[PDB]
A paper describes a structure:
Here we report seven high-resolution cryo-EM structures of filamentous peptide nanotubes based on a cross-α supramolecular architecture that provide insight into the designability of helical peptide filaments. This local interaction motif, designated as an arginine clasp, is robust within the context of these cross-α assemblies and can guide the coalescence of helical protofilaments into structurally defined cross-α nanotubes. In contrast to most structurally characterized filaments based on synthetic α-helical coiled-coils, the chain axes of the helical protomers are oriented in a plane nearly perpendicular to the long axis of the assembly.
Each nanotube was derived from coalesence of three protofilaments derived from the dimeric protomer. Among all three structures, the helices within the dimeric asymmetric unit could be superimposed with only minimal differences. Structural overlays of laterally interacting protofilaments indicated a conservation of the interfaces between the three filament structures. However, the axial interactions along the contour length of a protofilament for the Form II-like assemblies appeared quite robust and comparable in energy and buried surface area to that of Form I protofilaments.
Author numbering:
A (entry chain 5), B (entry chain BA), C (entry chain HA), D (entry chain NA), E (entry chain TA), F (entry chain 0), ...: 101 to 129
J (entry chain d), K (entry chain j), L (entry chain p), M (entry chain v), N (entry chain X), O (entry chain R), ...: 1 to 29
Amino acid sequence: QAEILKADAEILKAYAKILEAHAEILKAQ
Amino acid sequence: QAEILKADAEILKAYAKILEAHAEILKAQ
Amino acid sequence: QAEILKADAEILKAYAKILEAHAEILKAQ
Amino acid sequence: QAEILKADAEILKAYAKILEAHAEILKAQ
Amino acid sequence: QAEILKADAEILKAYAKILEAHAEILKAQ
Amino acid sequence: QAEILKADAEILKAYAKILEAHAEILKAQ
Amino acid sequence: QAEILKADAEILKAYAKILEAHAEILKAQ
Amino acid sequence: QAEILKADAEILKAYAKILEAHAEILKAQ
Amino acid sequence: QAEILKADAEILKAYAKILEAHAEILKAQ
Amino acid sequence: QAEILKADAEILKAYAKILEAHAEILKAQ
Amino acid sequence: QAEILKADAEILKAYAKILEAHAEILKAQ
Amino acid sequence: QAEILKADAEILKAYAKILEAHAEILKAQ
Amino acid sequence: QAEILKADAEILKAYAKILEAHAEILKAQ
Amino acid sequence: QAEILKADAEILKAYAKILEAHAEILKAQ
Amino acid sequence: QAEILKADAEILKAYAKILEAHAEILKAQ
Amino acid sequence: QAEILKADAEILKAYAKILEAHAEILKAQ
Amino acid sequence: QAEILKADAEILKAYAKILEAHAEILKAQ
Amino acid sequence: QAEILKADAEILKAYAKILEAHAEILKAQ
Amino acid sequence: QAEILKADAEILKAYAKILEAHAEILKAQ
Amino acid sequence: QAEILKADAEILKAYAKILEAHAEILKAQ
Amino acid sequence: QAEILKADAEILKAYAKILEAHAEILKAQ
Amino acid sequence: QAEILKADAEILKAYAKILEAHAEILKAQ
Amino acid sequence: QAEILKADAEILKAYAKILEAHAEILKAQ
Amino acid sequence: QAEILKADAEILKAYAKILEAHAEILKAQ
Amino acid sequence: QAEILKADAEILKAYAKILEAHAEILKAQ
Amino acid sequence: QAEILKADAEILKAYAKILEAHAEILKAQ
Amino acid sequence: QAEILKADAEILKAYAKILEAHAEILKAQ
Amino acid sequence: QAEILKADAEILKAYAKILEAHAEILKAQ
Amino acid sequence: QAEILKADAEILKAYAKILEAHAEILKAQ
Amino acid sequence: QAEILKADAEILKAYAKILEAHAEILKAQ
Amino acid sequence: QAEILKADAEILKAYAKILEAHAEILKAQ
Amino acid sequence: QAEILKADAEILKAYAKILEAHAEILKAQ
Amino acid sequence: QAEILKADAEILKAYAKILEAHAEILKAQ
Amino acid sequence: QAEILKADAEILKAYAKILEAHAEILKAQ
Amino acid sequence: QAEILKADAEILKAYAKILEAHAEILKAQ
Amino acid sequence: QAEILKADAEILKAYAKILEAHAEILKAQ
Amino acid sequence: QAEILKADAEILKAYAKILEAHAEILKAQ
Amino acid sequence: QAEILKADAEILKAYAKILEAHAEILKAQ
Amino acid sequence: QAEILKADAEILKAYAKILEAHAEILKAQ
Amino acid sequence: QAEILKADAEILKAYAKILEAHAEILKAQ
Amino acid sequence: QAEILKADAEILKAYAKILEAHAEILKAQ
Amino acid sequence: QAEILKADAEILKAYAKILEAHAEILKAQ
Amino acid sequence: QAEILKADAEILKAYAKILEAHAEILKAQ
Amino acid sequence: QAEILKADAEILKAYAKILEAHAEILKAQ
Amino acid sequence: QAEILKADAEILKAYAKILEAHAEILKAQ
Amino acid sequence: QAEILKADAEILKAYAKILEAHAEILKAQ
Amino acid sequence: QAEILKADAEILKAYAKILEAHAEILKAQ
Amino acid sequence: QAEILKADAEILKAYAKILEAHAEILKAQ
Amino acid sequence: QAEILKADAEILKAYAKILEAHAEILKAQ
Amino acid sequence: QAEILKADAEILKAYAKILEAHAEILKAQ
Amino acid sequence: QAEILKADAEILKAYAKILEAHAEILKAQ
Amino acid sequence: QAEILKADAEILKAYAKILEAHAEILKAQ
Amino acid sequence: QAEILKADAEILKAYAKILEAHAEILKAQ
Amino acid sequence: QAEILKADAEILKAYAKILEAHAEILKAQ
Amino acid sequence: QAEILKADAEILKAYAKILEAHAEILKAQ
Amino acid sequence: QAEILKADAEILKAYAKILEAHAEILKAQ
Amino acid sequence: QAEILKADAEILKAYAKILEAHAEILKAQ
């Protein structure tokens, strides 16, 4: 099951990346 | 059943890949 | 019934393959 | 009835085959 | 009634055969 | 699981970044 | 976990910044 | 944790600032 | 923690200011 | 006993819906 | 007893729907 | 009793729908 | 009692629909 | 026992919904 | 035992909902 | 045992809801 | 053991609610 | 162990409620 | 240990309630 | 240790109740 | 130590009750 | 020491009860 | 007094329902 | 007083329903 | 007072329904 | 006294329900 | 006394429910 | 005395519930 | 004496519950 | 004496609860 | 004497609770 | 003597509580 | 003698409380 | 003799209280 | 002899009270 | 003095209860 | 003084209840 | 003072209830 | 002060209910 | 202050209800 | 502040309802 | 801020309803 | 009114006569 | 009224006659 | 009324006759 | 009334006969 | 009444026969 | 009554037989 | 009654057999 | 009764076997 | 009874085994 | 019984082992 | 019993070890 | 107030008159 | 206020008059 | 306010007048 | 506000006038 958990971890990491990228774009605006 | 679980794991991995790729594209924009 | 379950497993595996392939194409774009 | 179940299993197997073949074609594109 | 059930089983078997044959043709394309 | 926790941490960090950036924009207005 | 806590701290700091900025704007009005 | 506490302190300080500013406006009215 | 306490003190001071200002307005009416 | 035959008819109607959906696919192409 | 015959008619109508769907497929080609 | 005959007529109408669908197929070719 | 005769007429009309469908087939050829 | 066949029909209807959704996808393209 | 098959059908219906949502995405683009 | 499969279906339905929400986002843009 | 998978599905549903709320934000703009 | 994951989901749901409230704010403006 | 995470979620939910109340204020204006 | 965080959340919830009451005032006007 | 923070929260809740009562007054007018 | 703060909160709650009673009076008029 | 007549009308309506049911029987034959 | 006449009309309408049901019988024959 | 006349009209309409039902009978013969 | 007549009407309505159920039986055959 | 007749009607309604259930059986066959 | 008849009706209703349950069984098959 | 009949009805209702549970079993299969 | 029959009914109801629990088990599988 | 039968019913109810708990276990898995 | 059987039922209920607690454990995992 | 069995049941209930507490621990983690 | 078993149960209940307190500790952390 | 075991249980209960007090301390912090 | 009028109202309410009970009687007949 | 008027209103409400009960009687007839 | 007017309104509402009951009577006739 | 006006509105609403009841009477005639 | 205006609107709505009831009267005539 | 305007709109809507009721009167004549 | 404009629109819509009601009056004449 | 009742009695008598005559005819068949 | 009751008695007698005659016919079949 | 009761008795007797006749027919099958 | 009771007895006897006959048929299968 | 009891006895005997016959069939499977 | 008891005994015997047969089947699996 | 007791004994014996068989299967896993 | 006791003994023995088997499995993990 | 006691002994032995095994696992962690 | 006592001894020994192992882990931290 | 005592001794020894280890950690802080 | 009391007296006198008149009528019956 | 009381007195007097008049009419019947 | 009270008095006087006039009319009938 | 009150007084006076005038007309009839 741990594989599922680490998959979730990578999911959330990517989500955070999307968030901070949108943040950088907002900062550029 | 464990085969189903690892299938799900690979599913979510691919989903995370899609997410981070869309994130990289957003970053390029 | 287990045959049905492993059939489902292969289904989901193929679905994940489709997903990651679409992801690679998105990455190429 | 089990015959019906294994018929379903073969159905789903063939469906998965169609899926992964379409996936390979998508990959070729 | 069981005769009806096994008839259905053969039906679904033939359907699966049609499916996998169409799949092989798709693979050839 | 700790990976999930640190993912959450990065999430919240990014959220705080969004917040303070919106704050800086409000300050500019 | 402490990382989560300091993330929260930064969150609340940003919130306070938003608050005092809104306060400065109210003062300007 | 003390960081959280001082964050709270700054929060409440900003709140007091909002309060006294609203008070000054009320006084002007 | 004392910072929190003095924050509270300033809070209550501002509240008293609001009160006496409302009182002065009532007196003007 | 008739309800058994009702279930059989349900089986067959399901199969019919399968074929109808297959036609829907093919028409969609 | 008649409801038994109703179920029989339901069987037959299901079969008819099967054939109709098959025609739908063929027409769609 | 008449409802029994109604069920019989339903049987026959189902058969008629079968033949009609067969004609639909053949016409579609 | 007449409703019995109505059911009889329904029988006959069903048979007529059968023959009509047969004609439809033959015409379709 | 019939409820077992009801479950079988449910299986098949699910498969039909799968195919229908696949058609929906393809039509959407 | 049938409830097991009900669960299987639930699996398949879930997969169908997945595909339907994917179509919804693609249509939305 | 079937309840295990119910949980699996719940997993998949959750994933479907994820994709549906993603579509909701994209449509909202 | 299944309840573990229930918790996993809860994780995923939470993530879905996150995305849905994000869409709600974006739509609100 | 699953209850740990329940707590994780609670974390995420809390974050979702945060975002939802943020949307509520923005909509209110 | 999980109860610690429960407390964290409580922190976050409190923050969410803060934002919700802020929205309530703004809506009230 | 978690109870400390519970107390922190209590602090924040108190602050939220403050803001909510402020909104209640403003709405009452 | 946490009980100290509990007392702080009690302070704040008291202040909130003050404001709520003030709103009660104003509403009563 | 915290009990001192408890007494302070008691002071404030008393004041709140005063204001609440004043509102009760005014409402009673 | 009128309610007495209402009861009389109820009597008559009951009798009418009797006759209607008798007709239902006869029609059913 | 008029409600008395309403009851009378109810009597008559009941009688009418009687006759109508009698006609229903006779028609059914 | 007019409602009295409404009741009278109701009487007459009831009588009309009586005659209409009588006609229904006679027609049915 | 009228309630006595209400009970009589209840008797008759019960008898009507009897006849209606008898018709239901006969129709079911 | 009327309540006696109510009980009689209850008897009859029970008998009607008996017949209705018998019809339910027969229909179920 | 009427309550005796109520008990009789209860007897009969119980018997009706018996038959209804028997129908439930048969339908379930 | 009637309470004796009530007990009899209780006996019968118990038997009915038995049959109902048996149906529940069979349906569950 | 009736209470004896009440005890008998209790016996039977217990047996019914047994069967119901058995069904609960089987359904749970 | 009846209380003896009450004890017997208690025995049986205990056994039922045993089976119910067993089902609870199995469901929990 | 019956109290002996009561004690037996107590034994069994204790065993049931054991199993229930075991289920509680397993669910908790 | 029965009291001996009561003591036995007490033993078992104690064991059950042990297991319940163990579950409480595990849940607490 | 039974009181000996009561003492044994007391031993076990004490042990259970030990474990419960241990859980209380762990939860408190 | 049993009283010896009672004393043992007293020992254990004392130890439990120790642990409970330790938890009380830790909770108090 | 008002309490005298309260007693008067009690008198009247008693009389009303008398009439209501009389109606209860008459309805019961 | 107002409570006197409350008593007066109680008088009147009692009278109203009287009339209402009288209506209840008359309706019951 | 307002409560006096509340009592007046209570007087009037009582009178209204009187008239309403009078209407109830008249309607009942 | 506003509550005084609320009482006035209550007066007027009472008067309105009076007139409405008067209309109810007149309509009832 | 706005609640004062709410009370005014309540006054006016009451007056409107008065006029509406007057119309109800006149229409009823 | 907006709620003040809401109250104003409520005033106006009340006036509109007044005029509408006046029209209702006039139409009723 | 937008909600302020919503209130303005509410004002205007109220005025529109006023004019519409005036038209209703005039049309009614 | 009693005249109406005896009219009803004669009605039902005639109905019973019709019933038993139809019964005699059924017996002759 | 007793005339109505005996009319009902004769009704039910005739109904029983119909029932037993239908029973004799069923027996002949 | 006893006439009604004996009518019911004959009703139920005839019903039992129908039941046992249907039983004899089932036995012949 | 005893006639009703013995009627019920014969009813239940016939029911038991039906049951054991169905049992013999099941045994033959 | 004893006749009813022995009827119940025969009922339960037949039920047991059905049970053991179903058991023998299960054993044959 | 003893007949009822021995009927119950045979019931439970058959139930035990079903149980041990299901056990033997489980053992064969 | 002893027959009931030995029936219970056989019940519990069979239950123990089921338990140990499930145990042997668990051991095989 | 001793048979019941030894049945319980075998029950608990089997339970202990299940426990130690689960223990061996835990040890293998 | 001693058999029950030794059963309990084996129970507790197995429990201790589970405990020490969990302890060894904790030690390995 | 001594077997129970030594079982308890082994229980407590294992508990002490768990304790000292947790202690060693705490020491490592 | 002495085994129990030495078990307790080892318990308390381990407890003292936990205490002094916590003490060493406190000393390190 | 005494006027109210004598009014009540006359009320009750009239009520008694109604009662004795109804009594005389009952006596005439 | 006394004017209100005497008004009530006259009210009740008139009510008594109505009562005794209705009584005289009942006496005439 | 007294003006309102005397208005009420005149209201009730007029109501009493209406009552006694209706009473005189009833007396004339 | 007193102006509003006296307006209400005049309102109620006029209402009483209407009432007594309607009363005089009723008296003339």
